[PDB]
Amino acid sequence: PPVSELITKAVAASKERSGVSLAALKKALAAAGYDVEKNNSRIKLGLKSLVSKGTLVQTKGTGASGSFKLNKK
DNA sequence: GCGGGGGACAGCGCGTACGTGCGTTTAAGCGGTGCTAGAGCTGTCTACGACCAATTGAGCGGCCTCGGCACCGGATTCCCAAACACA
């Protein structure tokens, strides 16, 4: 399954008012058996694609270093 | 021993400052010349310090006193830690 679903599912499972950090996303995907080490660069890209698709709102920071929430709009 | 909160450490981004490279300029390095100030050595003779015996008073041990400082309690003050009002 593509990493955009795994990320969206992790952000939905950890839904809050702040927003899953990249470190929490790493932890959730690793707990989901996804190798976050080798494919970290893929994650940053896929995450960026999800922000560029507007599917994730950046709530703090800039780019992948930030916190993110599912764009309910 | 325990609760917790701040700091250490991890991850990311970015932007500019440092490394690499190239061409030009500059002055370091080398050699060579010349001059003279001063370092190094020597002889003299003289004032200056070591040595010694005698004198003595300055300093050291021993006693004694009191005041400066330590201590205690009581009052004064001064930073504190969130909670509140209000943005």
Query: Resolution of the deposited coordinates, in angstroms?
Result: 3.8
From A65, A60, A58, select the one nearest A43 (Cα to Cα).
Answer: A65
Q: Edge-to-edge, what's the strand order for the sheet holding A20-21?
A: A20-21, A67-70, A56-60
User: Where does residue A3 fall: left (phi above 0), alpha (psi -120 to 50 degrees), or beta otherwise?
Assistant: alpha
Residue A37 CA to B57 C1' — how many Å? 95
Specify the experimental method: cryo-EM
Residue with the two structure tokens 């970290």: A40
| Distance in angstroms (rounded) separating the CA atoms of residues A29 and A49 | 17
Whether A3 contacts A64, CB under 8 Å? no
Chain A window 8-37: residues with CB closer than 7 Å to nucleic chain B are: 22-23
| Distance in angstroms (rounded) separating the CA atoms of residues A72 and A55 | 8
Residue A7 burial (CB count, 10 A): 24
Nucleotide showing the shortest C1' distance to residue A40 CA: B11
All structural domains of chain A with their residue ranges: 1-73
| Distance in angstroms (rounded) separating the CA atoms of residues A13 and A52 | 22
Strand B: which bases are under 7 Å from protein Cβ?
A: 11-14
Going from the C-alpha of A71 to that of each of A30, A41, A59, A63, A66, the distances in angstroms are 24, 23, 11, 16, 15
Whether A57 contacts A68, CB under 8 Å? yes
Six token digits for residue A44: 């940053």
